[PDB]
Design a protein around this nucleic acid. Sequence first.
DNA 1: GCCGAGAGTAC
DNA 2: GTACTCTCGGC
Length: 54
Amino acid sequence: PKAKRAKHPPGTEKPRSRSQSEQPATCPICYAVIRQSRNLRRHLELRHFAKPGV
DNA sequence: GCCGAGAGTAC
DNA sequence: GTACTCTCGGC
Ligand SMILES: [Zn+2]
């Protein structure tokens, strides 16, 4: 079928090896404070490079 | 409307 | 043994 990563099923333990590996992140354009670095990238495409490229 | 975090895998 | 990516839900 498919596989929507549903966090609804029980037994969802929160190991820190998921949030600890990530470290605070700031945007050097609008100083937006993004916690996870992976999200920082997404912030670039939404609040800056979100313009149609060429 | 954007943001914050969970899971599975590979080397 | 760790960090990686994609995905979902919330105020
Ligand atoms: Zn920014």
